Each structure stands twice: as C-alpha cells, then as structure tokens.
Amino acid sequence: EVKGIPVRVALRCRPLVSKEIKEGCQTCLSFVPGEPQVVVGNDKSFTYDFVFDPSTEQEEVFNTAVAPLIKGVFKGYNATVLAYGQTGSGKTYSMGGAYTAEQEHDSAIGVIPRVIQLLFKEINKKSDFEFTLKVSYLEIYNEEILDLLCSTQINIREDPKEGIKIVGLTEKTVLVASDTVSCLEQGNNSRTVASTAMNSQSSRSHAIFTISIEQRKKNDKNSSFRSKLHLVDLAGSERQKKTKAEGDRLREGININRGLLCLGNVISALGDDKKGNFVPYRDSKLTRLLQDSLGGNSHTLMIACVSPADSNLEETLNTLRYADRARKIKNKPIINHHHH
Ligand SMILES: Nc1ncnc2c1ncn2[C@@H]1O[C@H](COP(=O)(O)OP(=O)(O)NP(=O)(O)O)[C@@H](O)[C@H]1O
Ligand SMILES: [Mg+2]
C-alpha cells in the first residue's frame, strides 16, 4: 500500500565505460525484462518506478519518465527532476548538463534540452492560453551559490509567508525555444568542470536550471498559474583513492561529499516522516534549495544513475539504497493559483 504522492525514482544504468573495460571489470547489475527491478551483485533486488538498462537511449528515458512530469506544469504544478549518483555514473549526460549548440539534433541530447523542446511544443498547442517563461541557472560550488548566467554574493533568505528567495540571482525572460536553450548553453559554459581519474569532465558543483512558468487564459488575465520547474544536475560522490585528486580538486571533492551527506540525511529523515519529525534541510545550501522538491510542494522525479561495473559495487549499492529511500518521501504538490 502506497498512500499519497511519492517522489518517483528512475534507476538508470549506463553501459561500461573505457576506464572500467581497461581495469577488467565485469557487469554486476542484471535486469528483469519488462519489470522495474534491478538485481545487484547477482543477489540483492531493488524495485523503482522505472528501470533503464544500459541499452536505454536518451529519448526513451525522456518519453517514459520525464515527459509525463513536465506535462504537469501545464496544470499549474511545480516539478523537479534531479540526477543523483557516483562520479562518472551519467548525471550530466542524462540531464544535458554539458549540452552545447554543437549537440543540436544529436539523439544523444539529454533531459534539459528535451524539456525545452517539449514546453514550446505544448505552448503552441495551447492556443487559448498565454505564457510567460523566465530562466535562472545557478551552481553550488564549495558552499557558495554562483550565477551561471553572470559572465556580488548571492544569499538565501527565507520568506516567512512561504519559500526560499535566492537574493541577487539573475533571470532572463525567454520568448522561444532557441533563446531558452541559449541560456542552457551559456550556463553550461560557466559550470565549474575539471578532470579527475574517474571523470575527465567531472562536475565540481551542483547545478540547478529553473524555468519559471506563468500561464493564463487569454479571455481572463486576472487568474493565472505560477509555478517553477527545477532541473538539477548534482555533483557526485567521489573517493580520493579513485580520483587521485589533490589540492583544489580534492577540496572540491570534500565539499561535494559533505553536501551529498546532507542530502542523504534529508532523504533518510523524510522516509519515516511523521508529526513532530525534524528534517535537516538547513544543513546545506543544496538541501535548502531542494526543500520543496523533497517533501513539499512539487511533483519530483529522481534519476538515480549507476555504473554497472563490479569495481563500483559499493558506491552503486549506496545509490540504490538512497534511491529506494527517496521513494518513501511523500510530497504535497498543489495547483499554484494566483489572482491579481
Ligand atoms: N547512458 C550513457 N551512455 C553512454 N555513455 C554515458 C552514459 N552516461 C554517461 N556516459 C558517459 O560517461 C561519462 C561520464 O558521464 P557524466 O554524465 O559526465 O558523469 P557524472 O555522473 O555527471 N559525473 P560527475 O559530474 O563527476 O559527478 C561521460 O563521458 C558520458 O558521456
Ligand atoms: Mg557531472
């Protein structure tokens, strides 16, 4: 029995990568055809809302798991898609967190460029309605919020009558798909990325791409829906013994791991939520920004990314365990009406 509106979880297993083939890894994950199950270490089974094996292409991930969620923003809901998993697991790949214009029309494009396409397709169908879209794009780098659309210090202020405000963050008002994707491209070029042994293009920050959507009926300008879509490419857990990181790179890894610890503590707290519980959102900027997304006013999809390689079994088990806990989180999305 599942009561209410849980966080949904898609488990995505990428294929083996060159590093793993080089080191002689075997696959340690197996799948059960047509069932949303994965078997790990040929022994332990986990069930999710979706399971995508290594052959699953970007288009299928999007159409199966993401598109139905995005369509909910047109009913006036907030929604979040967040990718979570070890370094090198495929979060940025899945999300399109490194998309550039060079990738336009490549079937390898990920979630964010696909969301932008879909939003404008749906807007064009909804000829009886008018829309306002704005985008912001930030990263959380070594515990600071940096504006990725900014080629002063940004701070979180809690409004008493509902919600976080990110003071000093810029927004662009967009008109069509092309200028919306330009924002993604621009922010992606600013995202802090560096090499480690586990990923030559490791994300050194958590990135959040936000589209604010206002919808109103053309025959009635006073009433609207106003909601937000957050598209989140987290940084991933890493171990110095595998990354070989030193200096500033290792400091990034420490800050990343600490934040992900805070996220794990939030997920664990929410799994058994009840009256009088405490959930440690306040412990990190990341978990403050994800407060509505996890346990609050949002429809939320986690894309949990894993490597199939036996050398990563421990990390993969950690991701599977936390992704299993995330399914127990109950959200309370409402229709975000506004009247003027
Ligand atoms: N499903 C997939 N199919 C094929 N290649 C993949 C897939 N997922 C990831 N890759 C490749 O694996 C490498 C690492 O992916 P990436 O998405 O950068 O990892 P990440 O999870 O974002 N790591 P990090 O930012 O360090 O926490 C890249 O070269 C990707 O193109
Ligand atoms: Mg990444």
Side-chain angles (χ1 to χ4, degrees), residues 87-88 90-93 191 193 199 201-205 233-236:
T87 184
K91 300 179 292 301
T92 295
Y93 178 83
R191 172 89 173 279
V193 177
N199 189 350
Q201 302 280 174
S202 178
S203 314
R204 310 313 288 163
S205 66
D233 177 18
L234 299 176

mmCIF file of all heavy atoms in Angstrom, residues 87-88 90-93 191 193 199 201-205 233-236, ligand 2:
data_model
loop_
_atom_site.group_PDB
_atom_site.id
_atom_site.type_symbol
_atom_site.label_atom_id
_atom_site.label_comp_id
_atom_site.label_asym_id
_atom_site.label_seq_id
_atom_site.Cartn_x
_atom_site.Cartn_y
_atom_site.Cartn_z
ATOM 1 N N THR A 87 30.297 9.903 -8.932
ATOM 2 C CA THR A 87 31.042 10.473 -10.059
ATOM 3 C C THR A 87 31.180 9.476 -11.214
ATOM 4 O O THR A 87 31.463 8.301 -11.023
ATOM 5 C CB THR A 87 32.440 10.998 -9.622
ATOM 6 O OG1 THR A 87 33.097 11.633 -10.730
ATOM 7 C CG2 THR A 87 33.318 9.877 -9.088
ATOM 8 N N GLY A 88 30.948 9.966 -12.432
ATOM 9 C CA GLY A 88 31.087 9.182 -13.628
ATOM 10 C C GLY A 88 29.896 8.314 -13.960
ATOM 11 O O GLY A 88 29.927 7.631 -14.983
ATOM 12 N N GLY A 90 26.745 9.165 -14.869
ATOM 13 C CA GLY A 90 25.986 9.658 -16.026
ATOM 14 C C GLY A 90 24.927 10.706 -15.728
ATOM 15 O O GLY A 90 24.002 10.870 -16.505
ATOM 16 N N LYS A 91 25.075 11.433 -14.625
ATOM 17 C CA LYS A 91 24.131 12.500 -14.243
ATOM 18 C C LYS A 91 24.101 13.639 -15.277
ATOM 19 O O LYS A 91 23.054 14.020 -15.762
ATOM 20 C CB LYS A 91 24.500 13.085 -12.892
ATOM 21 C CG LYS A 91 24.495 12.093 -11.699
ATOM 22 C CD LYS A 91 24.888 12.760 -10.398
ATOM 23 C CE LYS A 91 26.348 13.201 -10.380
ATOM 24 N NZ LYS A 91 27.317 12.108 -10.568
ATOM 25 N N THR A 92 25.271 14.174 -15.606
ATOM 26 C CA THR A 92 25.366 15.294 -16.547
ATOM 27 C C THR A 92 24.916 14.830 -17.930
ATOM 28 O O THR A 92 24.154 15.522 -18.617
ATOM 29 C CB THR A 92 26.798 15.843 -16.562
ATOM 30 O OG1 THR A 92 27.089 16.408 -15.282
ATOM 31 C CG2 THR A 92 26.982 16.956 -17.602
ATOM 32 N N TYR A 93 25.375 13.645 -18.326
ATOM 33 C CA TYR A 93 24.956 13.035 -19.566
ATOM 34 C C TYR A 93 23.445 12.910 -19.632
ATOM 35 O O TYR A 93 22.819 13.292 -20.637
ATOM 36 C CB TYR A 93 25.597 11.664 -19.732
ATOM 37 C CG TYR A 93 25.162 10.966 -20.995
ATOM 38 C CD1 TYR A 93 25.791 11.246 -22.189
ATOM 39 C CD2 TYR A 93 24.112 10.067 -20.998
ATOM 40 C CE1 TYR A 93 25.405 10.617 -23.352
ATOM 41 C CE2 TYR A 93 23.729 9.430 -22.162
ATOM 42 C CZ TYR A 93 24.377 9.710 -23.329
ATOM 43 O OH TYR A 93 24.001 9.107 -24.519
ATOM 44 N N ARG A 191 29.704 26.505 -15.977
ATOM 45 C CA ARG A 191 29.694 25.473 -14.930
ATOM 46 C C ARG A 191 31.114 25.049 -14.615
ATOM 47 O O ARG A 191 31.905 24.826 -15.532
ATOM 48 C CB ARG A 191 28.898 24.254 -15.398
ATOM 49 C CG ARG A 191 28.945 22.993 -14.496
ATOM 50 C CD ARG A 191 27.834 23.097 -13.511
ATOM 51 N NE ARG A 191 27.615 21.913 -12.652
ATOM 52 C CZ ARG A 191 26.953 20.822 -13.026
ATOM 53 N NH1 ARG A 191 26.505 20.699 -14.274
ATOM 54 N NH2 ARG A 191 26.719 19.876 -12.138
ATOM 55 N N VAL A 193 33.882 22.710 -14.082
ATOM 56 C CA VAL A 193 34.140 21.339 -14.526
ATOM 57 C C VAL A 193 35.647 21.134 -14.513
ATOM 58 O O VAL A 193 36.397 22.022 -14.930
ATOM 59 C CB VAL A 193 33.569 21.098 -15.949
ATOM 60 C CG1 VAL A 193 33.899 19.693 -16.447
ATOM 61 C CG2 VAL A 193 32.059 21.324 -15.976
ATOM 62 N N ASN A 199 36.496 10.833 -13.946
ATOM 63 C CA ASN A 199 35.754 11.557 -14.980
ATOM 64 C C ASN A 199 36.569 12.762 -15.477
ATOM 65 O O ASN A 199 36.829 13.695 -14.737
ATOM 66 C CB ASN A 199 34.366 11.990 -14.447
ATOM 67 C CG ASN A 199 33.449 12.560 -15.532
ATOM 68 O OD1 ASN A 199 33.862 12.827 -16.669
ATOM 69 N ND2 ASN A 199 32.197 12.781 -15.173
ATOM 70 N N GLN A 201 35.640 15.083 -17.299
ATOM 71 C CA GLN A 201 34.756 16.244 -17.295
ATOM 72 C C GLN A 201 33.827 16.207 -16.080
ATOM 73 O O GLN A 201 32.606 16.347 -16.201
ATOM 74 C CB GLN A 201 33.944 16.264 -18.579
ATOM 75 C CG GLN A 201 34.793 16.287 -19.856
ATOM 76 C CD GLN A 201 35.355 17.636 -20.249
ATOM 77 O OE1 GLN A 201 36.161 17.740 -21.213
ATOM 78 N NE2 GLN A 201 34.942 18.675 -19.560
ATOM 79 N N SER A 202 34.420 16.014 -14.911
ATOM 80 C CA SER A 202 33.685 15.928 -13.661
ATOM 81 C C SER A 202 33.048 17.262 -13.316
ATOM 82 O O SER A 202 33.714 18.322 -13.338
ATOM 83 C CB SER A 202 34.585 15.497 -12.511
ATOM 84 O OG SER A 202 33.841 15.481 -11.303
ATOM 85 N N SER A 203 31.767 17.219 -12.954
ATOM 86 C CA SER A 203 31.095 18.430 -12.476
ATOM 87 C C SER A 203 31.563 18.747 -11.049
ATOM 88 O O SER A 203 31.437 17.900 -10.150
ATOM 89 C CB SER A 203 29.592 18.254 -12.477
ATOM 90 O OG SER A 203 29.110 17.678 -13.686
ATOM 91 N N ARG A 204 32.109 19.942 -10.814
ATOM 92 C CA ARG A 204 32.634 20.262 -9.493
ATOM 93 C C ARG A 204 31.658 21.074 -8.620
ATOM 94 O O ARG A 204 32.028 21.625 -7.563
ATOM 95 C CB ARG A 204 33.982 20.988 -9.626
ATOM 96 C CG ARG A 204 34.993 20.300 -10.545
ATOM 97 C CD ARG A 204 35.164 18.795 -10.322
ATOM 98 N NE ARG A 204 35.888 18.498 -9.085
ATOM 99 C CZ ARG A 204 35.916 17.320 -8.475
ATOM 100 N NH1 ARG A 204 35.219 16.296 -8.949
ATOM 101 N NH2 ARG A 204 36.653 17.173 -7.373
ATOM 102 N N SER A 205 30.402 21.092 -9.040
ATOM 103 C CA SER A 205 29.357 21.858 -8.395
ATOM 104 C C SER A 205 28.016 21.189 -8.674
ATOM 105 O O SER A 205 27.908 20.397 -9.613
ATOM 106 C CB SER A 205 29.314 23.253 -8.997
ATOM 107 O OG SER A 205 28.908 23.189 -10.356
ATOM 108 N N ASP A 233 21.313 18.930 -11.866
ATOM 109 C CA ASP A 233 22.439 18.040 -12.171
ATOM 110 C C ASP A 233 23.365 18.132 -10.947
ATOM 111 O O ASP A 233 24.172 19.059 -10.812
ATOM 112 C CB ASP A 233 23.116 18.486 -13.462
ATOM 113 C CG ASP A 233 24.328 17.664 -13.812
ATOM 114 O OD1 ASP A 233 24.450 16.534 -13.261
ATOM 115 O OD2 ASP A 233 25.200 18.156 -14.598
ATOM 116 N N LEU A 234 23.201 17.199 -10.016
ATOM 117 C CA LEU A 234 24.041 17.190 -8.820
ATOM 118 C C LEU A 234 25.472 16.809 -9.170
ATOM 119 O O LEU A 234 25.720 16.117 -10.133
ATOM 120 C CB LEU A 234 23.531 16.195 -7.786
ATOM 121 C CG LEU A 234 22.127 16.426 -7.224
ATOM 122 C CD1 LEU A 234 21.774 15.290 -6.285
ATOM 123 C CD2 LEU A 234 22.047 17.789 -6.553
ATOM 124 N N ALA A 235 26.404 17.271 -8.354
ATOM 125 C CA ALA A 235 27.712 16.664 -8.286
ATOM 126 C C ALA A 235 27.574 15.289 -7.608
ATOM 127 O O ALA A 235 26.523 14.965 -7.039
ATOM 128 C CB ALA A 235 28.689 17.592 -7.568
ATOM 129 N N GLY A 236 28.583 14.449 -7.791
ATOM 130 C CA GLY A 236 28.515 13.047 -7.385
ATOM 131 C C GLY A 236 29.537 12.681 -6.336
ATOM 132 O O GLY A 236 30.591 13.326 -6.196
HETATM 133 MG MG MG B 2 28.540 15.655 -13.911
#
